[PDB]
Structures are given as structure tokens and as C-alpha cells.
A = this chain, B = another copy of it.
Amino acid sequence: CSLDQTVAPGNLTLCGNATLFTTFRPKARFIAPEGWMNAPMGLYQRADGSIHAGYQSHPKHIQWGNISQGAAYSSDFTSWTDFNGSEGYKTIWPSQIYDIRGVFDGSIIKEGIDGYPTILYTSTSFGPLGATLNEAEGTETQSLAYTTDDGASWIKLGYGAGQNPVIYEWPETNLTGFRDPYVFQSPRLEALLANTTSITNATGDHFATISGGVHGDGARLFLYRQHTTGEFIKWTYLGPLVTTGYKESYGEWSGNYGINFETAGVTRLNPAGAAWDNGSDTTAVDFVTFGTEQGRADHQNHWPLWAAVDYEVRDNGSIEAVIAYSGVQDWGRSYAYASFPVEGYRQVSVGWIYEDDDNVILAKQFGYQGAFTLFRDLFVKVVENVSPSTPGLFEQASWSTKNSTDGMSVTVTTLGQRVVPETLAAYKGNSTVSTLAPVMLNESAAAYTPFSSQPTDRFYALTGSFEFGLNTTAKAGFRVLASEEEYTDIWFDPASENLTVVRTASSLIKSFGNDTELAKVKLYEIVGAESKTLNLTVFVDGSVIEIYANDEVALSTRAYPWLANSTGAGLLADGTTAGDVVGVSGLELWDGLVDAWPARPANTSQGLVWDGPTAAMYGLFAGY
């Protein structure tokens, strides 16, 4: 095993465990110290204003198993510190018959048991567990634990009658899944249900959704309501909140609803951020976010979706969330988005970016798998004065349209997403910032034009505004992590409405994924404008490439170039001519970003271990 990045890669499968630990590793984002991670969990803003972030964790392994909550905290979403206790950076782990198979996703009741922050989580035990398997009742239940030390440790309620697990009966037969409890307060839902509380007797101020589905009949989000305020044992099933069909798709802008939901959440937003009104705010919109499985041919069969919904009250005192429009939270290699409330009327969302090594060829050599996305403020994106001649505008796929009285303009409403400002400020302020001169891409434009200032490593941000003609057939974008022999190309093609990441040359190492990523982006044309604009921001962080367009579209992916000099970046141009010109302005390079884990050394591997021959006997975990 040679680690010479000035020559072609050898056979890297001969390299030892964690020998490639630093090679492709993100430095500027949330990531476990080592080993396997997946979904964010247990997210909450603590009493001191800091952010507690949990995550599904399997230390010293590079596949999922014994799944536990790893945790850390931050005052600004950006610079983090690990918890350190008797189980290292873990704070909840399998320990009881009811959760011994895994401590799955859960969410926080901020004022819970004895007034302490309390997690409601999926406690798993033995048996087939999966949407394509024959799961039985009891395998997935929901349990409580609380913290008296602000997340350094958690105390589970006892096992038994009237204690853990607190939710165990399947609300409908033949479930595909029954997990990922999302606890939330909702003045909106309380107001809607207030006239029906005699029917159900459920009058608490917390609601909980549980994600699942029904075999052969599509996904389901089940709604529960806390039976009595201040009491956390009894949760009353109201009914299904979201019901979708078996592999139903709302269309090209909306992914596919698959067969089963995972990590679903419920929020209410307005143009500024989170909305906590009872329905009285006419600018507020109710949203559900959710993962779906088995409705996609690639990306691990997983879509991270969202939908705007209109609530209807059923006669039995439950709520039907009728989907008004439906979109995609991230179009790339990410899943398991969780959102949580933050002071100042914010709702903040974060997901998990998996690797692109699905055959597990270099995972042991990495010594870790997975990272988070960046933390994103959610809000209602409103675009005013939109031209009715915007192509496809009245499909209203992942947006709504409201005509002006005179019919000459349209107001567009959709889900907005933007990186939390704390992170953008910290990134910019800690970076070497190069403000670049605007560039007209015309007949003289090369295919690739390096920026006048270049990155110094694999940790940088790019921004640019691309102005296109209304009838352009030109393509433009950014090339990143680039040398002569390796590069990753981010293209937007207004004629097709497709944002792509072409990865055929991303790496000389052939075992990593190289498929083309694709997102749809609607450029809402403004009344009186003779052009249409794409605002593109790109974060490069080790192997993560995370793309944001117009505070709306997100696409996370992976690139693993071998050569030490595959760090460059610049502009891409295709079919730009004297007549079909792309004007690029607001160009900026931020070189360096932030060291997100200042207390961690460069190599936080502790080695990898094997569970031994019993892993296959138990059949629950891969064992490595």
C-alpha cells in the first residue's frame, strides 16, 4: 500500500484499517470521530442556547449495528465538541430487552419527565425488521429516556407495564415499519382538534408522528397525541396523517413515495422561518418532511422528500394531511433529514450524507462512514411578480401559484432552504476570500476556465450568479476538485431545467460511484426581465460536494479524487456563443472554511473490530 498522491493510485484494498482516514475526510461539518454514522437524532436547543445533536452511531465498525446515539454540542451549528462519558461519545446504547437490537431514531420533548429534556425513540428487539420483510408487532416499539445533565447521559424509564416501552401496539395491521417518533407542539393542530377532544379524550400539548406504511398499500405517517398535558406515558393514536399509494409519484419534481416512510417530521413555516400560530397567519404553510424507501432505482432506494399539506379534521377526531404540492429536500446522496425548533422563530433541518462506496471496497481503509449535511434554515420561499410565460409554471408541481387580480403576474410559494447564517459567517470569516471579477461566457469561452484565485486544499466554498437568456440552449456551471486528470463538473442546463453533477472523471479510483447526479430547478422568470438567473453556492469539504440553488434546491454528493492536486475550481461553459451568452457575476471563493472539531486531532480512529462468528449466528448486524 502506497499513499503517494503524486502518482496513480495502486490497489488501495491492500491498505490497512484507517490508512485512508484523512485522505477524503470532511473537516468543516458535523461528523462522528470515527466509524459508522447515519441519521441525525435527538436534536434540540439546550437551555443555554447551545445545540445538542445526536446521531445513529456504530463506533469502531464501518457498517451499521448495535446502533446507538453518539452526541455533540455547539453554540453556532459550526464548531462542535464531543461528549465524553463512560461510553466515549455515545450517550444512549442498546441495554434492555426492548432496545437491545438498536436504539433507532428519536426526538426531544424539551419539558418532559420531571421537567427534563426527554427523548422518545424507537426501541428495537429481535425479529425480521424491514419494509420488505415480514415484521411482527413488538420488534419496533417506542420508549422514553430523560437527561438530568443536558445530554451527557440519559436515564431510561424502567421496563414494564405502565413504563417502557410506552408505545408498542401497531395502530393498523401488516405494517411495513413503525419507527422514528417525531414529537412536536402545534397550536395549529390543537385548534383544529379542540372541538373533537370528547371523542378521543386526548388533550395534551404534544403530538407525535410515527413513520411506516402497510404491506402492498403504500406509506403511512401515523399521528398520536399525548393523552394528558404533563404526563408522558400515555399517547393516543388518532389516525393516519399522511397516506400515499404503493410507489405513487406526484411527478418529475417530486421523487416517489415508495412503500414506507422513515424519519418523517411535521412543521409549520412562514416567509421568515417557523410559524407558531393557530392558523390565523395567512402566510404560514403546514409541511411534512419524510424519507421514502423502495421507490428509487439508485441512491440506496431512498428519497428525502417534503410536502405542503392542508389539514382536514375527520369525524373520529383525527387529522388528514392532504398533499397540496410535493418536492425533494435534497436530490443527491443524502437522507434522514430531521428538523427542530430554534429560538427566534426558526426551524432548522439537517440530514445524513452517505458515502459512495456501496460495495464496501474501501470502508475499512477509511475507518469511518458518513457525515451530516450542513444545517439549513427552513422557511416559506415566496417569489413575487413571476411572469405567466415561465415554462411549466402552472403544473404547480413542488410549488403553488396565486394569480394577481389582473392575471398579468403570479406569486410563487414553495419550501425554502438556506444554510444557517452562523455557518456562512464563520466559513467566510475563517477563509481566505477571493472576490472574483464577473465573467461573460460567449464564443471565446473555453470549456473550463480556472478561477483567477485557486483553492489550496479540499475545503472551500464557491458562489456565483449565472444570468441566462430566456431562450438559451447554453449550459454553464462550476468544475471542482479539479486537476488535468480528475475533476467533478456541476452543470445547469436551463433548456432541460436540469442541474447535473457529472462524475465520470471525479476519481482515478474506480470502485467509487460515478453516476450523474440530477436535480430539477425551476427558474421563475420575473415580469419585465429579459433574462433568468441561477444563484449557485457550492461547498467542497473533503469528499462532500454540497450544492444549493436559489435558496430552494439542494444536492449533496461525493467525489474521491486521488491526486493531491485535484483541488482546483473554475467556470464551465457549453454552447456559449456571441449570441447565446451567460453572464456570471457575484463570484466568490472562500478557501479554508472552518475547522469544525477544534479539539479533535487529525486522526481520531481507534481502530476497527470484528464481532466474531456470533454476528452471523444472531443475524442482526454485519459484524464489522
Contact = CB atoms under 8 A, between A and B. Distances in A.
Given A100-B100, A126-B126, A161 B609 contact: yes
A159 interface: yes
Given A159-B611, A161-B612, A610-B161, A168 B617 contact: yes
Interface in A121-161: 125-126, 136-138, 141, 159-161
B618 A126 contact: yes
A165 interface: yes
A618 B125 contact: yes
A470 interface: no
Interface of A: 66, 94-95, 97-98, 100-101, 125-126, 136-138, 141, 159-163, 165, 168-169, 609-614, 617-618, 620
Contacts of A125: 618
Given A97-B620, A126-B126, A168 B138 contact: no
A158 to B, nearest CB: 9
Chain B CB within 10 Å, residue with most, of A100, A162, A169:
A100
A614 B291 CA distance: 28
A126 B100 CA distance: 11
B141 A614 contact: yes
A161 B163 CA distance: 35
Contacts of A66: 97
A160 B609 contact: yes
Given A125-B618, A138-B617, A612 B162 contact: yes
Contact of A611 (B161, B609, B611, B617): B161
Nearest to A141: B614
Contacts of A620: 97
B138 A98 contact: no
B94 A97 contact: yes
A555 to B, nearest CB: 38
Nearest to A94: B97
Contact of A160 (B95, B165, B611): B611
Nearest to A163: B612
Contacts of A136: 617
Given A100-B100, A160-B612, A610-B161, A137 B168 contact: no
A573 to B, nearest CB: 55
A618 B96 CA distance: 12
Contacts of A165: 614
Given A141-B614, A160-B609, A168-B614, 7 more contacts: A97-B101, A97-B620, A138-B617, A160-B612, A161-B610, A161-B613, A163-B612
8 nearest A-B residue pairs (beta carbon)? A138-B617, A161-B612, A126-B126, A161-B610, A100-B100, A160-B611, A168-B614, A160-B609
Contacts of A163: 612
Given A126-B618, A168-B617, A610 B160 contact: yes
A613 B100 contact: no
B98 A614 contact: yes
A155 to B, nearest CB: 13
A610 B159 CA distance: 9
A618 B124 CA distance: 11
Contacts of A100: 97, 100
B138 A618 contact: yes
11 contacts: A97-B100, A97-B618, A136-B617, A138-B614, A141-B614, A160-B610, A161-B610, A163-B612, A165-B614, A168-B617, A169-B613
A510 to B, nearest CB: 31
Contacts of A617: 136-138, 168
A514 to B, nearest CB: 34
A94 B100 CA distance: 10
Contacts of A613: 161, 168-169
Contacts of A126: 126, 618
A138 B94 CA distance: 19
Nearest to A98: B614
Contacts of A169: 613
A93 to B, nearest CB: 10
Nearest to A166: B612
A165 B168 CA distance: 31
A620 B160 CA distance: 14
**Highest count of chain B CB atoms <10 Å: which of A141, A612, A613:** A612
Contacts of A97: 66, 94, 100-101, 618, 620
Nearest to A169: B613
A310 B550 CA distance: 87
A66 B620 CA distance: 21
Contacts of A161: 609-613
Which of A101, A168, A617 is packed against the most chain B CB atoms within 10 Å?
A617
